[PDB]
Design a protein around this nucleic acid. Structure first.
Length: 62
DNA sequence: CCTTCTGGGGAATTTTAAACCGGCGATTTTGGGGAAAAAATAATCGGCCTTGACAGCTGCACAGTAAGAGAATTATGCAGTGCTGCCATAACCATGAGTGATAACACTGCGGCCAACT
């Protein structure tokens, strides 16, 4: 999905469903799906391209 | 025994309070003109969010009706030929009018001759 020009990668269960992003004025993004809370997206100051996110998820699943 | 004092009541008069109506002074309001600001509306800009497609391609089959393409057949219009009659034209002569021609001068076009350059 996308948020303010940055694209995030969720897991299988979340594909094809509507999540709710909640962003404090502090500057931290929290993803709430179906009332519950899902894993944090380790938001970073430096923007990383979708390709780098795919590579990171690939290495993590490896 | 008598005199004087006092009190009540009706009439006349005076003063002050209240209410209305008018006059006078002030602010408000309406209208027009000029400037400034706000808002509304439309157009243009950037960007985010989300999803469709790209994955060999589409031609054929059936249903009913209508059209059309080709070939055979039929109808009709043109053409061809013969005989007779009528209308047009043409041929000649006369007279009038238009144009082609002829004379003369002036300007221009074409052919013969001379010279200059390569």
């Amino acid at each position: 999905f996308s948020y303010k020009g940055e694209q995030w990668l969720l897991s299988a269960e979340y594909a094809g469903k509507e999540i709710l992003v909640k962003e404090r004025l502090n500057g931290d993004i929290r993803l709430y799906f179906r009332g519950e809370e899902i894993s944090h997206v380790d938001q970073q100051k430096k923007v990383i391209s979708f390709a780098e996110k795919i590579k990171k998820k690939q290495t993590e699943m490896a």
